[PDB]
Design an enzyme around this catalytic site. Structure first.
Site, PDB file in Angstrom:
ATOM      1  N   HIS A  52       0.745  -1.389   0.160  1.00  0.00           N
ATOM      2  CA  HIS A  52      -0.068  -0.072  -0.079  1.00  0.00           C
ATOM      3  C   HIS A  52       0.985   1.271   0.107  1.00  0.00           C
ATOM      4  O   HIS A  52       0.312   2.586  -0.093  1.00  0.00           O
ATOM      5  CB  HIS A  52      -0.993   0.001   1.160  1.00  0.00           C
ATOM      6  CG  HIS A  52      -0.477   0.617   2.469  1.00  0.00           C
ATOM      7  ND1 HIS A  52       0.015  -0.289   3.540  1.00  0.00           N
ATOM      8  CD2 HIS A  52      -0.340   1.727   3.021  1.00  0.00           C
ATOM      9  CE1 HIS A  52       0.524   0.486   4.503  1.00  0.00           C
ATOM     10  NE2 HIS A  52       0.006   1.755   4.310  1.00  0.00           N
ATOM     11  N   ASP A  94      -0.054  -7.357   2.282  1.00  0.00           N
ATOM     12  CA  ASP A  94       0.480  -5.885   2.066  1.00  0.00           C
ATOM     13  C   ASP A  94       2.090  -5.898   2.072  1.00  0.00           C
ATOM     14  O   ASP A  94       2.638  -5.629   3.226  1.00  0.00           O
ATOM     15  CB  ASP A  94      -0.095  -5.079   3.092  1.00  0.00           C
ATOM     16  CG  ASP A  94       0.425  -3.655   2.906  1.00  0.00           C
ATOM     17  OD1 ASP A  94       0.548  -3.303   1.584  1.00  0.00           O
ATOM     18  OD2 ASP A  94       0.427  -3.033   3.899  1.00  0.00           O
ATOM     19  N   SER A 127       4.713   2.910   7.827  1.00  0.00           N
ATOM     20  CA  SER A 127       4.151   1.686   6.765  1.00  0.00           C
ATOM     21  C   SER A 127       5.173   1.395   5.889  1.00  0.00           C
ATOM     22  O   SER A 127       6.229   2.049   5.580  1.00  0.00           O
ATOM     23  CB  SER A 127       3.210   2.157   5.856  1.00  0.00           C
ATOM     24  OG  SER A 127       2.069   2.513   6.630  1.00  0.00           O
TER      25      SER A 127
END
Ligand SMILES: *[C@H]1O[C@H](CO[C@@H]2O[C@@H](C)[C@@H](O)[C@@H](O)[C@@H]2O)[C@@H](O[C@H]2O[C@H](CO)[C@@H](O[C@@H]3O[C@H](CO[C@H]4O[C@H](CO)[C@@H](O)[C@H](O)[C@@H]4O)[C@@H](O)[C@H](O)[C@@H]3O)[C@H](O)[C@H]2NC(C)=O)[C@H](O)[C@H]1NC(C)=O
Ligand SMILES: *[C@@H]1O[C@H](CO[C@@H]2O[C@@H](C)[C@@H](O)[C@@H](O)[C@@H]2O)[C@@H](O[C@H]2O[C@H](CO)[C@@H](O)[C@H](O)[C@H]2NC(C)=O)[C@H](O)[C@H]1NC(C)=O
Lengths: 31, 258, 259, 33
Positions: B43, B99, B205
């Site tokens: 992502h 992810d 992230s």
């Protein structure tokens, strides 16, 4: 390449030195 | 990283910084898993909800860094991207399942006191270390505090942040979210009871969730920061991509393009 | 409201819309508890985190509306506010504990087929109806869908939405959030392994959470939408201001600033 | 009746008053156990 020596930090594991908190990680293994 | 601390020099030599070329903005975190391969969260590259769709040229990587501002001459290293590989079954529409993403650097990077890859777990280590209660370490440059109110300017760390988080029990966190938590992910974070605070934020992230095997003293990347919530209005635990669970794929990609 | 349905004419005659006077924008939901008193959520009026700090003269209220688009000839009423009262122990920095406020209208509103006050529970009603599994009703003009991505435009309901949600067990609720839930609040919502979907959103804040007493069949306002997470990126259950738990403050204000 | 019309609160003119049940109030009633 690099796998043979992966996960070993030059300024720490290679110099037989610990970082300020890795001890805390080891302790979590012992409930 | 909320409630973390400044990382010591070379404490996380596998730390990588994902950037956008123009305008030059820090996007995510990533990890060095070899001289030419970098692991990150999908992502971070592809997420239609936040108008994110990046190609090898839009991005640029920085390894060996410790200070987000100051340029570290003969220490940090920039690297262009040759190819981007996003897991085929990556589900962004629902839960960010799978992810994960690989990025092959145009030219290999030289290792040093400040740059060294991290190990990927094997069945024995994943089974042995990936257990509730055990603590892992998360690192990154995401905000130092709340980012759900207005303004992005404040709260940006000057130097790499680090925090150790305990692995949460699968059922305990399934009950903390209305999001379908698959076997390809695990949660981590302190329950508000425990005094010790600390957590990963969105800006972290793609960064690595590592653990130091007591069996061989090597640092292993057990997860990828998939959804840190330390800076959100709410969010009990953080979501991570179970790396070992997707290793079969990681190897397939590597064992074919380099 | 997400996954709800259109309310029927006169189904929630105690429904009130809270507007910003200028620029004119719909802010929150609210409920009519008397001909001069309106109940709403404190963070609707005061919430520094989002540049919100309104006083009586910054607001305007519309009562008796069913459609947000068309003007409702001889049905809806527009009213100004004389004074607003935010609970003194209202905590906005941490968990919206005591997220409740009262608004007194400049003049009494006239009841009708479309405007009627809802009841406030007493000890017994609360103890009898505020139980896990028991369902309550939520109404509002919040968004119809996901609002964590860009744009606010799409997703706005033309007519008042309604949705019935089950009350959730406190321990279960605490398992889903990191916010310190207090006894001055409760949660509601379905489990994700739902056979039933539906939840309140941020736009429904201040709106009522009502339950029909099976004893005297009157509608009671058990809670106030304090934090609906239906349109958020995540959020297992919503947080409602426990109305009975805060009744003493409600009556105190009413008794001291009303005839 | 504190201003309002307490004596008659909770009874909708177009439902409880006309002895009409709304589309989903039964779902609420059924949840009582
Ligand atoms: C949000 O609500 C009000 C906002 O009031 C004002 O208008 C808004 C639009 C905005 O411009 C805001 O900045 C203005 O304050 C906030 O008001 C309270 O806090 C302020 C800041 O601390 C108080 O100001 C203090 O006033 C002291 C006394 O002087 C004043 O005396 C009376 C009030 O009793 C006023 O009428 C006078 O005009 C005079 O200013 C000073 O000693 C002190 O240095 C400081 O200036 C203000 O008095 C407060 N308002 C009242 C009467 O309660 C409020 O704090 C804020 N809430 C949030 C977001 O937390
Ligand atoms: C991520 O972007 C893909 C490429 O997008 C194109 O190139 C951008 C630089 C920009 O100019 C954009 O407007 C272009 O569409 C996108 O693929 C789509 O576009 C390509 C190129 O024209 C086209 O061949 C392809 O069929 C398109 N994809 C489909 C089938 O819709 C890609 O879809 C997007 N990722 C996702 C899934 O959101």
């Amino acid at each position: 390449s690099g796998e043979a020596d992966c996960g070993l930090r030059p300024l720490f594991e290679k110099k037989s030195l610990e970082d300020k908190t890795e001890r805390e990680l080891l302790e979590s293994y012992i409930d | 990283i909320v409630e973390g601390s400044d990382a010591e020099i070379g404490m996380s030599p596998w730390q990588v910084m994902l950037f956008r070329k123009s305008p030059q903005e820090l996007l995510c975190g990533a990890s060095l898993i070899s001289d030419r391969w970098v692991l990150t969260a999908a992502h971070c590259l592809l997420y239609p909800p936040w108008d994110k769709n990046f190609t090898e040229n839009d991005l640029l990587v920085r390894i060996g860094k410790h200070s987000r501002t100051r340029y570290e001459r003969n220490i940090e290293k920039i690297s262009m991207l040759e190819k981007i590989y996003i897991h085929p079954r990556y589900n962004w529409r629902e839960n960010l399942d799978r992810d994960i993403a690989l990025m092959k650097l145009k030219k290999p990077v030289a290792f040093s006191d400040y740059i060294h890859p991290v190990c990927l777990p094997d069945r024995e280590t994943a089974a042995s270390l990936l257990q509730a209660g055990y603590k892992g370490r998360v690192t990154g440059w995401g905000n130092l505090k709340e980012t759900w109110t207005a303004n992005v300017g404040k709260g940006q760390p000057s130097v790499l942040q680090v925090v150790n988080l305990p692995i949460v029990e699968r059922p305990v966190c399934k009950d903390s979210t209305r999001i379908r938590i698959t076997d390809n992910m695990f949660c981590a974070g302190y329950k508000p009871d425990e005094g010790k605070r600390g957590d990963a934020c969105e800006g972290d992230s793609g960064g690595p969730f590592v653990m130091k095997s007591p069996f061989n003293n090597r640092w292993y990347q057990m997860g990828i920061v998939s959804w840190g919530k330390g800076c959100d209005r709410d969010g009990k635990y953080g979501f991570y991509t179970h790396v070992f669970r997707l290793k079969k794929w990681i190897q397939k990609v590597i064992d074919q393009f380099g």
